[PDB]
RNA sequence: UGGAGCGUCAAUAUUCUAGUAUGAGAAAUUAACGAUUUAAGUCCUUCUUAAAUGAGGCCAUUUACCCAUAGAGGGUGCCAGGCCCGUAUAACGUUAAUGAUUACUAGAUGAUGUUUCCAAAGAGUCGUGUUGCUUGAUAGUGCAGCACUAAGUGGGUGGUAAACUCCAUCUAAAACUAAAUAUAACCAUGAGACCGAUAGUAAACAAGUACCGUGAGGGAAAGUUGAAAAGAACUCUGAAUAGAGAGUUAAACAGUACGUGAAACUGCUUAGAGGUUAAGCCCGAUGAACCUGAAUAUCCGUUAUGGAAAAUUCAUCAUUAAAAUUGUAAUAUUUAAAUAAUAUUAUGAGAAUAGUGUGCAUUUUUUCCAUAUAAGGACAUUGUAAUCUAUUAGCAUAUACCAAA
RNA sequence: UUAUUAUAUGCACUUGUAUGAUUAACAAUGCGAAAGAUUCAGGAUACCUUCGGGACCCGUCUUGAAACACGGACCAAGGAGUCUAACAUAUGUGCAAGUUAUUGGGAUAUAAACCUAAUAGCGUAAUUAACUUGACUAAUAAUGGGAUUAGUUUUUUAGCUAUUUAUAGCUAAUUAACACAAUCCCGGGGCGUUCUAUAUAGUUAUGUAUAAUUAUGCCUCUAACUGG
RNA sequence: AGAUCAAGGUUAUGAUAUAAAUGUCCCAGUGGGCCACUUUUGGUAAGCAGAACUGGCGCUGUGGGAUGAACCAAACGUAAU
RNA sequence: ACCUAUACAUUACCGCUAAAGUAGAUGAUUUAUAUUACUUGUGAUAUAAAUUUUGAAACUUUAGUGAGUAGGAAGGUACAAU
RNA sequence: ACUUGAUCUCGGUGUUCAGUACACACAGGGACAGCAAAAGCUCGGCCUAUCGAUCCUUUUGGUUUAAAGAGUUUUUAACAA
């Protein structure tokens, strides 16, 4: 504040706001292929939100 | 840091002399260097060296003992005490405040300062008045 | 449950506010132990506070080719190759334990130096006080020499970070070391069929004679 | 939960804080890696500002 | 942000001895932030223990 | 444990319903106590918001040990906080006293992947595995890898 | 987690070990516990006027009466370190507990490498089938009843069954051990973000008692006169407990619901009133009745002018004593230098107080007294008079427009 | 020619026009009277007294309650949104490719705090059912390019105020850069399923050629790698 | 069809903007309704049922047809005119 | 010709929404006067006098505007112990 | 007359609506073809009906990995229609 209150030769850098990984829970209606949006997992592996709806043979592909 | 506004937001509400009384929006404190009791950011306990106090008398009723600011020669953390030096005007009724207005050359506090004096000598006048009525 | 939020996986069915211990005696469970250990270490000697020798190295699986757990084994078959003397070392205090059959020669060696790391600073207090056969020293008595009773008993403290700022520097850098991990690892998928390639090769020419 | 009691130090005590929180140029000593923390406003005057 | 910035504090004996020759510096913690959001709070939510 | 003037229901008394309705109000469970019936009548708020459920993706991995898939993964782009940070400054003089030696098993990192895009320096590096997109780019960069013991 | 013996390899031995007398140590010490000390005002005056701990004070030593290694508490006629036990370091004392030696009793020479001779090992159980509870355990976890019925380089075990090749690691059906772990019990012990007699254990007390059910068992209600019992003598009246006097106490407006005494009911006296919306209110007044809020140095002035008093860093006042402040100059702490910043060092100006001084009260200074222009009020409620934005009612000076003549 | 209007009023002064939500001169009525205490307005404080209009008597389910719908005799004390469990989001506070003691000991006064080591949670780097494999052609790239762009830089233009006519300010334009953030498309890449390019030569090494695991040559039977 | 130069008026209907522009909590509720005009089925029909398009009632007092949730005026800060 | 509404209009006022202004006071500011630079006349100097404070979470100022159960957030007060 | 497009394959799109899932139609891209001389037409009935999600049982499947020490061989286990 002592130097350049005018802002002559001054740069202004603001970071990203889809940056945080907790901010991809939006906005789901899975029928579209614009679904793309990270469901709330329990934890990775198998038998975790991966049989009925996602893949082919267990009812339907999303 | 020994900084004037750092004397203020930390003593904005957490003061231990500042008793507000449920009603008057947020005023009152009894700090010894208050002199006008709200908080300007200057009417208060030590602002770092624009301090002012007008304390009567202590010897009734002549003197008006007044401190001043203990400036740049002193840090002013405790000193071989130098923060106060207690000049006392006396021997006048309506002349000596001009000596008091001449006493000072950091001129923002001034109008309030003698505004104590124009009633505090009135607070310690009234013995040759108010009397007999026989 | 109303919305896109979190399959609720919580196991409080068994009317699980029944039998719950409250952990409200954490710190008095520190000032019993720390009060009794300094009663369990005032008792013995200027002998240290644990204090056997605890030699063992090298934690089991691919999670650890690095660390080394603090010594419950002590390998009876190491001992005769290192100047002991089993039951004499037991009342010394070794934690001598008669059941571990340590398999590696340098792990045999690893406690061997660790044995000889001790047994020399071990000050040999006399039994008959003629002190003709003890036989390291008796003039290094602990009032004269040590009387230390220090706790920690170090386990070499797991040194390397490092980084090794070392020139090598190669000449045979035309040698693709990655393909070893692809040839030989596919070779493990063939060792059954290669020995079965070996039975169709080494037994095919015997059908020619009849 | 209020600042400021009237505090009285001694000389052997007062020459340990430099150990206990190092300086603006270094880390500290008696704690591993506890650096001296930061200000978010490094001149804090307003009248002389 | 100056390293010492107030580097004169004297040491006194019981008769308050208003000058002594050893004048140690100020250990650069009286420039640290004085912050009443983390002393309002982390006091009383650690008082509770 | 709350500062309860903030907590929603110390200004709600008195409204004369307190926050949960005045027609079909707060009856101890309407829902089905839990997750019923994800196939049955809570269908719509379980697909959407939670597909892939209910079923069997298949490999009955009998008693996984989570050690055989340990492989902690480091990337080639870091690589020089791995070495000393100022130690990179003396490698750009130029002095070709290096490739340096970069152990990974002593670090706590196992398989060198290849996000990377390293500098031009040669490096002698030791990993527990390889990655093909990295190791060719290392081999253009004058350094090569050798598998750790 | 295994053998013994022989030779061989080495060390070696009046020895040491453990037990129980033993006194370490001229009982020296660690404690365990009771134990035992009080450290220092009950100081001089007010209130109490029912009681002082609260109230006033108390040479210095930088303002302590006094102590503090004791200032946590509870008894005390109110809030107490010094009134009292206590609590503070500790001493006193008893019991163990640390055994130097002495005795008796009991045993012991190795480990050490080598190969000779013998290396013997748990029998209705393993395990398979199969039924039935049960498991994280799924062609099986163990535990069981039934049928089976084992081998000796074997038996299990290696989380997918089955042989078949091996490998690794352990050796079934025999048996014991202080610990670090659990504690609404029982026994002595302290502790705080707990309740304050419709709370807290079912009960603060003669709560698992009064009490009902025959039974199993169900279980409530009820704590708190004042500092002291000083509990109301005696007189009068009735046949009495009583009731009036007389008392007692600071209190009886504290007398066995014995502190505080509400709320609903209302008994009483005074005040009003009335055949009404059935009682109620709400809106604005309404007598009655007590109440509330009421005041200050000019029109055409915060003017002219004359009277006194005290005084004086102020005069046109001089010096001197300061301490500062501001603003320079220098030095010292700086992240190589400057700067910034404190600390001391001096200059600078002016102000600034304490003290003296033409006249120092000569025409000054500071407090009271005076007339003069509208004039002693300067304020509140009121009647005007006009102004202003809205706004009604009541007359209109001259136009201009077609046609209608 | 005839009408017309404003411009050609400085200098002081004036209780004086108008202007800062443009209200105010006058007059009357009265002493804040030692204590005492009259006067003028107001004042259902919560009654009572006197009249004018209003007016169903309170919860609650329901389209609807004054309900000829249920609950309410009156009152004092007690009573109903809490506990933890893990999550999500919003948000405060430190820190940062790091973060975390809070299972532990030790320092030392006590349930506090202090100090602390290996781990180990969680992120780092994804997955396919798994075995494998593993994230932009490069010593670099940022939803890789595009348009939407604040802001800064810059081209020159006039321009204004200061103007020294420099130096700047503020215009609008204009030149270029970067394009922040943020949506919208285009990419490329890890991974998988699909054909395909292999007609495959190639490729490297076992092999192979010789020297003696060891050296070099090469064919490449063998592997493996490479194609969109 | 794409990138990139060349020329280009004053941007191209009216009237406004009480401000426009979006991502989370899927945020508490609520998922039983009623009526008049026209338009209108079911029934002979009804203060019944059954609806499409509006306005209103529930949520709403209000001045007016004495009265009356909807009728017709108007949609409710405290005050004088 | 009159008649009445909590509607319409204007003056005050309340809260709410929106917009806008204010911090070198060891200054700013007039009022006079001594002077002066003098530029006719505008300015600087000096004297004398007086006005000049706030949780910038303040303060000034401006317009518009106000029904409400089911329900959500906004500051405000009781009764607690730490 | 002559032939099997009532085909393999990849993902989007139509009406059901929360712009979900099933289903059914529709336009492609790639293939393999079938008739017709060609251009073309054909991814089933001329279009509005002629129909189903996990768990398994079960085929068809690469000639496919998993059985967690190492083979070989059978079994199951998995992915895909």
């Amino acid at each position: 504040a002592l130097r350049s209150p005018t802002g002559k030769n001054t740069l202004l850098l603001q970071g990203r706001r889809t940056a945080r990984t907790a901010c991809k829970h939006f906005g789901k209606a899975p029928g579209v292929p614009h679904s793309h949006t990270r469901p709330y997992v329990r934890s990775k592996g198998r038998k975790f939100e991966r049989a009925r709806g996602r893949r082919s043979s267990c009812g339907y592909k999303k | 840091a020994t900084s004037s506004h750092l004397n203020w937001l930390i003593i904005r509400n957490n003061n231990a002399f500042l008793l507000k009384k449920r009603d008057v929006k947020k005023p009152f404190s009894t700090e010894p260097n208050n002199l006008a009791s709200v908080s300007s950011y200057r009417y208060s306990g030590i602002v770092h060296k624009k301090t002012l106090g007008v304390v009567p008398a202590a010897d009734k009723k002549g003197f008006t003992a007044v401190l001043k600011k203990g400036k740049y020669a002193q840090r002013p953390a405790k000193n071989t005490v130098r923060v106060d030096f207690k000049a006392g005007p006396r021997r006048s009724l309506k002349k000596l405040k001009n000596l008091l207005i001449g006493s000072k050359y950091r001129k923002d506090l001034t109008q309030a300062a003698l505004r104590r004096a124009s009633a505090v000598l009135r607070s310690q006048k009234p013995a040759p008045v108010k009397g007999k009525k026989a | 449950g109303k919305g896109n939020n979190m399959i609720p996986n919580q196991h409080y069915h068994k009317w699980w506010q029944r039998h719950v211990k409250t952990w409200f005696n954490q710190p008095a469970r520190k000032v019993r132990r720390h009060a009794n250990r300094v009663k369990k270490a005032k008792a013995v000697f200027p002998r240290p506070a644990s204090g056997a020798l605890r030699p063992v190295v090298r934690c089991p699986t691919i999670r650890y080719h690095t660390k080394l757990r603090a010594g419950r084994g002590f390998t009876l078959e190491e001992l005769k190759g290192a100047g002991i003397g089993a039951n004499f070392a037991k009342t010394i205090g070794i934690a001598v334990d008669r059941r571990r059959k340590n398999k590696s020669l340098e792990s045999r060696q690893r406690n061997i130096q660790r044995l000889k790391e001790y047994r020399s600073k071990l000050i040999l207090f006399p039994i008959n006080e003629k002190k003709i056969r003890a036989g390291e020293s008796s003039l290094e008595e602990c009032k004269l020499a040590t009387q230390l009773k220090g706790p920690v008993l170090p386990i070499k403290n797991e040194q390397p970070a490092v980084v090794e700022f070392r020139e090598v520097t190669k000449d045979e850098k035309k040698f693709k070391a990655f393909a070893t991990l692809r040839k030989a690892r596919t070779d493990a998928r063939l060792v059954g069929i290669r020995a079965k390639r070996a039975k169709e090769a080494a037994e095919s020419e015997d059908a020619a004679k009849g | 939960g209020h600042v400021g009691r009237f505090v009285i130090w001694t000389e052997s005590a007062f020459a340990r804080l430099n150990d206990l929180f190092g300086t603006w140029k270094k880390p500290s000593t008696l704690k591993k890696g506890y650096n001296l923390p930061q200000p978010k406003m490094a001149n804090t005057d307003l009248s002389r500002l | 942000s100056l390293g010492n910035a107030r580097p004169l504090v004297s040491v006194y004996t019981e008769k308050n001895e208003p000058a002594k020759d050893k004048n140690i510096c100020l250990p650069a913690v009286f420039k640290a932030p004085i912050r009443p959001d983390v002393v309002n709070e982390v006091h009383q939510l650690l008082r509770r223990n | 444990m709350s500062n309860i003037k903030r907590k929603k229901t110390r200004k709600l008394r008195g409204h004369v319903s307190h926050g949960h309705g005045r027609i079909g109000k707060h009856r101890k469970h309407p829902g089905g106590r839990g997750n019923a019936g994800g196939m049955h009548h809570h269908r719509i708020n379980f697909d959407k918001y939670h597909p892939g459920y209910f079923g069997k993706v298949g490999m009955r991995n009998f008693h996984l040990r989570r050690q055989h898939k340990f492989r902690p993964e480091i990337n080639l782009d870091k690589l020089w906080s791995l070495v000393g940070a100022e130690k990179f400054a003396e490698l750009e003089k130029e002095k070709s006293t290096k490739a340096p030696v970069i152990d990974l098993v002593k670090f706590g990192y196992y398989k060198l992947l290849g996000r990377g895009h390293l500098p031009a320096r040669p490096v002698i590096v030791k990993a527990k595995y390889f990655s093909k997109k990295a190791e060719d780019k290392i081999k253009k960069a004058g350094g090569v890898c050798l598998l750790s013991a």
Side-chain angles (χ1 to χ4, degrees):
Chain A
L2 297 154
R3 197 159 307 179
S4 173
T6 71
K8 292 193 76 51
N9 272 312
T10 312
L11 281 181
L12 182 64
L13 297 186
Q14 326 186 5
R16 300 179 83 176
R17 284 188 221 147
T18 68
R20 44 163 187 166
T21 79
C23 193
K24 285 182 288 296
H25 309 325
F26 323 112
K28 192 155 213 290
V32 299
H34 214 279
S35 312
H36 282 211
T37 177
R38 203 161 299 212
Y40 277 142
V41 184
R42 192 165 108 201
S43 204
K44 292 162 288 199
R46 84 172 265 258
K47 288 194 296 303
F48 290 103
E49 296 90 21
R50 226 185 287 131
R52 191 186 152 273
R54 287 279 160 85
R55 311 185 28 209
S56 51
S57 171
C58 184
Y60 65 94
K61 180 214 304 298
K62 172 191 288 180
Chain B
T2 82
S3 316
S4 186
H5 267 259
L6 211 71
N7 198 237
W8 215 59
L9 299 142
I10 309 180
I11 315 296
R12 155 169 211 272
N13 267 181
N14 298 18
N15 182 3
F17 293 121
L18 189 138
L19 260 75
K20 41 173 303 195
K21 274 88 178 179
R22 204 188 172 250
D23 228 328
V24 197
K25 210 167 177 186
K26 264 147 107 143
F28 292 137
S29 75
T30 174
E31 289 154 74
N33 304 319
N34 193 170
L35 81 96
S37 301
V38 286
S39 43
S40 41
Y41 58 95
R42 186 52 49 81
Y43 283 143
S44 202
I46 324 170
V47 76
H48 278 326
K49 296 154 291 181
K50 191 36 185 147
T51 83
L52 199 161
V54 181
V55 282
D59 42 355
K60 312 172 185 53
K61 297 168 182 183
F63 270 122
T64 47
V66 163
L67 57 99
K68 203 61 171 180
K69 301 206 315 301
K71 218 71 156 180
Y72 272 153
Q74 180 40 246
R75 185 208 162 290
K78 279 317 269 197
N79 322 116
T80 75
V81 179
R82 290 203 288 165
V83 291
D84 63 324
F85 264 107
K86 275 194 166 58
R90 215 254 313 272
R91 294 300 299 167
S92 150
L93 302 190
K94 294 300 214 163
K95 173 197 74 67
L96 77 175
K97 305 144 280 288
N98 185 272
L99 274 296
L100 185 54
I101 207 180
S103 62
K104 47 181 69 67
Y105 308 100
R106 277 70 40 201
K107 301 186 185 182
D108 211 331
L109 280 181
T110 65
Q111 183 92 86
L114 84 161
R115 217 172 62 181
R116 271 163 102 82
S118 161
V120 82
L121 282 159
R122 207 183 64 215
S123 82
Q124 298 192 0
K125 186 249 293 180
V129 294
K130 91 188 167 55
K132 332 300 159 174
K133 190 43 184 60
Chain C
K2 43 179 81 85
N4 187 40
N5 36 5
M6 196 42 113
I7 283 270
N9 50 357
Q10 273 319 308
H11 290 44
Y12 272 69
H13 265 274
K14 302 179 169 64
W15 290 1
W16 274 90
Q17 322 294 94
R18 267 184 90 73
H19 56 271
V20 159
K21 179 54 174 200
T22 195
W23 259 120
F24 257 106
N25 54 18
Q26 171 83 60
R29 269 165 68 155
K30 188 177 166 285
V31 201
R32 154 162 92 252
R33 307 169 159 123
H34 182 32
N36 269 329
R37 156 175 48 235
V38 306
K39 186 51 70 179
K40 288 148 182 174
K42 189 255 162 184
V44 281
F45 205 63
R47 190 152 53 251
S50 191
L53 266 205
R54 315 247 77 82
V56 161
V57 293
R58 258 126 193 84
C59 318
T61 176
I62 212 169
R63 208 97 187 277
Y64 304 97
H65 290 174
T66 77
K67 287 279 285 286
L68 46 93
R69 176 60 157 105
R72 301 193 174 185
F74 250 132
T75 171
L76 181 50
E77 288 91 9
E78 264 197 5
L79 310 183
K80 274 183 273 201
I84 47 165
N87 280 131
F88 164 65
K90 191 260 182 178
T91 79
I92 287 168
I94 281 300
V96 70
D97 163 75
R98 52 180 57 189
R99 180 211 51 245
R100 200 266 296 242
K101 306 174 93 185
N102 183 77
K103 74 184 191 184
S104 148
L105 305 190
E106 68 274 8
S107 74
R108 199 152 286 245
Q109 278 302 313
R110 204 58 163 269
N111 320 305
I112 271 170
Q113 277 98 38
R114 206 167 193 265
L115 171 137
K116 285 156 184 59
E117 198 171 14
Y118 293 87
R119 175 61 195 85
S120 44
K121 58 183 57 182
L122 157 57
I123 37 173
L124 266 305
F125 280 171
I127 300 181
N128 47 316
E129 280 221 354
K130 207 210 299 178
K131 66 207 59 74
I132 54 169
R133 292 302 280 252
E136 276 297 315
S137 160
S138 281
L139 319 179
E140 296 159 4
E141 187 265 330
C142 55
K143 163 262 291 182
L144 314 155
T146 79
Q147 216 259 154
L148 305 188
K149 48 158 85 56
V152 78
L153 201 79
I155 307 146
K156 284 168 184 49
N157 273 316
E158 271 75 358
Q159 43 274 27
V162 165
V163 51
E164 265 204 80
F165 187 46
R166 324 268 77 86
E167 172 265 353
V168 160
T169 38
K170 218 199 181 194
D171 197 5
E172 287 167 318
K173 58 204 51 160
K174 45 157 187 172
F175 277 82
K176 326 158 291 290
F178 87 103
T180 47
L181 300 103
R182 279 318 281 181
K183 184 174 293 184
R185 191 255 158 271
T186 50
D187 294 347
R189 265 152 74 94
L190 264 44
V191 295
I193 210 72
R194 281 175 194 177
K196 291 308 179 296
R197 273 157 183 190
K199 67 106 177 181
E200 50 91 15
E203 277 88 349
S204 43
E205 79 292 340
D206 310 280
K209 311 100 171 173
Chain D
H2 286 312
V3 313
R5 271 179 63 236
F6 163 63
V7 169
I8 296 165
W9 308 87
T10 76
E11 155 64 30
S12 290
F14 197 70
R16 289 276 274 265
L17 285 88
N18 44 8
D19 309 267
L20 279 151
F21 307 96
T23 171
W24 202 47
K25 95 208 287 183
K26 267 188 303 299
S28 188
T29 74
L30 293 206
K31 276 85 79 171
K32 75 160 164 60
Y34 190 87
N35 205 279
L36 191 60
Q38 325 303 116
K40 297 184 180 183
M41 180 144 188
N43 215 57
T44 197
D45 194 296
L46 198 65
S47 177
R48 210 184 254 108
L49 193 41
Chain E
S1 158
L2 188 49
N4 36 5
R6 297 136 198 178
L8 267 187
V9 279
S10 296
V11 297
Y12 296 154
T13 93
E14 69 99 17
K15 282 175 181 301
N16 206 4
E17 291 312 300
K20 278 304 294 294
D21 212 351
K22 165 67 182 182
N23 295 329
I24 206 164
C25 173
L26 209 62
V29 307
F30 305 91
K31 60 102 174 170
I34 310 163
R35 292 189 56 239
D37 201 7
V38 201
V39 188
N40 185 12
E41 171 194 57
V42 183
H43 163 94
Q44 40 82 35
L45 282 160
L46 184 152
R47 196 201 73 75
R48 214 177 248 178
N49 262 352
Chain F
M1 185 155 176
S2 293
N3 178 46
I4 323 175
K5 183 257 186 175
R6 268 154 214 172
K7 197 201 275 299
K8 173 186 152 176
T9 78
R10 294 293 193 197
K11 291 149 194 151
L12 285 180
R13 50 193 77 190
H15 282 266
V16 199
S17 62
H18 201 86
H20 292 250
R22 202 197 268 270
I23 294 147
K25 64 180 89 171
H26 196 129
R27 298 263 179 263
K28 306 289 182 79
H29 283 298
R33 199 181 264 252
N35 312 316
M39 194 50 105
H40 213 257
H41 95 292
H42 264 272
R43 182 171 304 277
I44 273 89
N45 203 133
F46 268 160
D47 47 347
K48 56 191 187 141
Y49 310 159
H50 278 300
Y53 199 44
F54 306 108
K56 182 161 101 177
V57 305
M59 207 49 191
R60 305 189 312 127
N61 214 327
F62 271 76
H63 195 191
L64 168 66
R65 303 143 174 79
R66 200 160 203 97
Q67 288 101 316
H68 278 232
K69 316 173 84 88
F70 194 22
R71 273 189 277 194
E73 294 171 349
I74 208 174
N75 267 7
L76 205 60
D77 201 21
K78 276 191 154 52
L79 201 61
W80 302 93
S81 175
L82 270 65
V83 314
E86 45 266 31
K87 208 151 282 190
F88 184 73
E90 297 91 39
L91 263 70
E92 316 311 304
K93 299 204 171 307
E94 205 268 347
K95 309 175 305 197
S96 282
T97 173
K98 288 314 152 273
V101 162
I102 299 185
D103 190 290
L104 273 297
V105 183
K106 294 166 191 41
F107 272 154
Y109 293 99
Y110 279 54
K111 162 198 289 192
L112 197 67
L113 270 193
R115 173 202 256 175
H117 271 299
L118 68 160
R121 297 314 302 155
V123 281
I124 284 300
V125 73
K126 273 194 292 183
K128 287 200 54 170
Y129 280 124
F130 78 93
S131 55
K132 185 53 168 55
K133 193 192 184 289
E135 298 300 323
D136 314 340
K137 292 300 299 299
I138 305 161
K139 276 204 298 180
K140 191 203 165 310
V144 285
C145 165
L146 300 94
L147 161 64
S148 304

